[PDB]
Design an enzyme around this catalytic site. Structure first.
Site, PDB file in Angstrom:
ATOM      1  N   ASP A 103       0.867  -1.173   0.000  1.00  0.00           N
ATOM      2  CA  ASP A 103       0.000   0.000   0.000  1.00  0.00           C
ATOM      3  C   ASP A 103       0.909   1.229   0.000  1.00  0.00           C
ATOM      4  OD1 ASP A 103      -2.696  -1.308   2.119  1.00  0.00           O
ATOM      5  OD2 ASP A 103      -2.432  -1.304  -0.059  1.00  0.00           O
ATOM      6  N   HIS A 143      -1.548  -9.618   9.898  1.00  0.00           N
ATOM      7  CA  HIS A 143      -2.279  -8.380  10.162  1.00  0.00           C
ATOM      8  C   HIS A 143      -1.980  -7.955  11.601  1.00  0.00           C
ATOM      9  CE1 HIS A 143      -5.957  -5.793   9.297  1.00  0.00           C
ATOM     10  NE2 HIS A 143      -5.647  -5.503  10.548  1.00  0.00           N
ATOM     11  N   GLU A 195      -8.549  -8.356   0.264  1.00  0.00           N
ATOM     12  CA  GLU A 195      -7.926  -8.982   1.424  1.00  0.00           C
ATOM     13  C   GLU A 195      -8.603 -10.296   1.799  1.00  0.00           C
ATOM     14  OE1 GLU A 195      -6.182  -6.753   4.882  1.00  0.00           O
ATOM     15  OE2 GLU A 195      -8.119  -7.286   5.773  1.00  0.00           O
TER      16      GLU A 195
HETATM   17  C1  LIG Z   1      -4.665  -2.405  13.359  1.00  0.00           C
HETATM   18  C2  LIG Z   1      -5.572  -2.734  14.285  1.00  0.00           C
HETATM   19  C3  LIG Z   1      -6.762  -3.634  13.774  1.00  0.00           C
HETATM   20  C4  LIG Z   1      -8.285  -3.124  13.890  1.00  0.00           C
HETATM   21  C5  LIG Z   1      -8.592  -1.799  13.076  1.00  0.00           C
HETATM   22  C6  LIG Z   1      -9.405  -1.973  11.779  1.00  0.00           C
HETATM   23  O1  LIG Z   1      -8.383  -2.559  10.907  1.00  0.00           O
HETATM   24  C7  LIG Z   1      -8.940  -2.910   9.643  1.00  0.00           C
HETATM   25  O2  LIG Z   1      -9.096  -4.334   9.592  1.00  0.00           O
HETATM   26  C8  LIG Z   1      -9.784  -4.759   8.397  1.00  0.00           C
HETATM   27  C9  LIG Z   1      -9.974  -6.259   8.503  1.00  0.00           C
HETATM   28  O3  LIG Z   1     -10.685  -6.602   9.685  1.00  0.00           O
HETATM   29  C10 LIG Z   1      -8.990  -4.338   7.151  1.00  0.00           C
HETATM   30  O4  LIG Z   1      -7.754  -5.033   7.122  1.00  0.00           O
HETATM   31  C11 LIG Z   1      -8.726  -2.826   7.174  1.00  0.00           C
HETATM   32  N1  LIG Z   1      -7.901  -2.445   6.044  1.00  0.00           N
HETATM   33  C12 LIG Z   1      -8.043  -2.441   8.492  1.00  0.00           C
HETATM   34  O5  LIG Z   1      -7.854  -1.010   8.564  1.00  0.00           O
HETATM   35  C13 LIG Z   1      -6.776  -0.474   7.864  1.00  0.00           C
HETATM   36  O6  LIG Z   1      -5.549  -1.003   8.403  1.00  0.00           O
HETATM   37  C14 LIG Z   1      -5.324  -0.644   9.789  1.00  0.00           C
HETATM   38  C15 LIG Z   1      -4.026  -1.305  10.210  1.00  0.00           C
HETATM   39  C16 LIG Z   1      -5.275   0.881   9.949  1.00  0.00           C
HETATM   40  O7  LIG Z   1      -4.146   1.402   9.261  1.00  0.00           O
HETATM   41  C17 LIG Z   1      -6.554   1.510   9.399  1.00  0.00           C
HETATM   42  O8  LIG Z   1      -6.449   2.926   9.445  1.00  0.00           O
HETATM   43  C18 LIG Z   1      -6.790   1.057   7.955  1.00  0.00           C
HETATM   44  O9  LIG Z   1      -8.039   1.555   7.496  1.00  0.00           O
END
Ligand SMILES: CCCCCCO[C@@H]1O[C@H](CO)[C@H](O)[C@H](N)[C@H]1O[C@@H]1O[C@@H](C)[C@@H](O)[C@@H](O)[C@@H]1O
Ligand code: UD2
Ligand code: HG
Ligand code: HG
Ligand code: HG
Ligand code: HG
Length: 266
Positions: free
Chosen positions: A132, A154, A224
């Site tokens: 990204d 993750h 994802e």
């Molecule tokens: C990092 C802590 C995890 C919980 C926050 C939400 O994270 C999101 O998780 C979903 C899957 O469940 C996707 O992977 C999203 N892309 C995640 O959010 C993105 O990535 C995280 C790490 C942050 O950078 C957030 O700002 C992004 O939108």
């Protein structure tokens, strides 16, 4: 291939684990990359002797072109330094790509998108790393990650049980993964491997998404979700620890992370 030269380094200790706080190998014997598990001098030697070239791909459309400067500048400081690197920037604003100074042996190709071959990758690089763009490198990200196929844990689910993983749970979706299946929750923002394996993954993801679209369904976390389904069925040969994709603002700096290598930009 060719023999390594004489090297002086600490002898590995058979009766002393690298880390006693984390899992460093998956059940299919793929290493899980954490700081302390690898000797970068040995790895650098092995890959340089192969004159390895690493392609780094990023997409920067619309407002995301604003993240390119920091992304590229920090990549120059921490990504595969010493090795051949080819940056591939896919954008809808070619003229907006910042003029970043690159070290020797490194190049950047700007590819305008809105459509416009994968054969090019096969002849220009040995490995592809797909990430990204709204990120920045803060520490070493090197050849220790190179392998036929790798996924990254993750940062928000590495300590969660599979039932809590946000996989696609609807059987109607090709990305479907039941509550009793799953190894890890990989994030779509950092994956890679050999050009061949990366193209196989993206081709499989593309087909699965087209099938879902036809059946009028969209996976909960889109790309994802499909990436996770793919890596469940085709085990990665290396798994990267959350050191490789973290968000310090949202998650801080846990003791288990000795280094924060690639992070989200606030
Ligand atoms: C990092 C802590 C995890 C919980 C926050 C939400 O994270 C999101 O998780 C979903 C899957 O469940 C996707 O992977 C999203 N892309 C995640 O959010 C993105 O990535 C995280 C790490 C942050 O950078 C957030 O700002 C992004 O939108
Ligand atoms: O924009 P989009 O509106 O398609 O996507 P979005 O803002 O929902 O973001 C999804 C995620 O994809 C990544 N992303 C998105 C667009 C782009 O050109 N490059 C990129 O890397 C970024 O990490 C972002 O957090
Ligand atoms: Hg070790
Ligand atoms: Hg890619
Ligand atoms: Hg896809
Ligand atoms: Hg995918």
């Amino acid at each position: 291939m060719v023999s390594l030269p004489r090297m002086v380094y600490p002898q590995p200790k058979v009766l002393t684990p690298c880390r006693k706080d984390v899992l460093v190998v998956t059940p299919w014997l793929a290493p899980i990359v954490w700081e302390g598990t690898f000797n970068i001098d040995i790895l650098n030697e092995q890959f340089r002797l192969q004159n390895t070239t690493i392609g780094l791909t990023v997409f920067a459309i619309k407002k995301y072109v604003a993240f390119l400067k920091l992304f590229l500048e920090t990549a120059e400081k921490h990504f595969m330094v010493g090795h051949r690197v080819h940056y591939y920037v896919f954008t809808d604003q070619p003229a907006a790509v910042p003029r970043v100074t690159l070290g020797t042996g490194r190049q950047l190709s700007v590819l305008e998108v809105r459509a416009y071959c994968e054969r090019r990758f096969l002849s220009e690089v040995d490995y592809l790393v797909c990430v990204d763009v709204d990120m920045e490198f803060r520490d070493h990200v090197g050849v220790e990650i190179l392998t036929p196929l790798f996924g990254t844990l993750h940062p928000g689910f590495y300590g969660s049980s599979r039932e809590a993983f946000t996989y696609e749970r609807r059987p109607q979706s090709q990305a479907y993964i039941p509550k009793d299946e799953g190894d890890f929750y990989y994030l779509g923002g950092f994956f890679g491997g050999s050009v061949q394996e990366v193209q196989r993954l993206t081709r499989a993801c593309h087909q699965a998404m087209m099938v879902d679209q036809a059946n009028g369904i969209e996976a909960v976390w889109h790309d994802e979700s499909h990436l996770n389904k793919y890596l469940l069925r085709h085990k990665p040969t290396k798994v990267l620890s959350p050191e490789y994709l973290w968000d310090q603002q949202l998650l801080g700096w846990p003791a288990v992370l000795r280094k924060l290598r690639f992070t989200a930009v606030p």
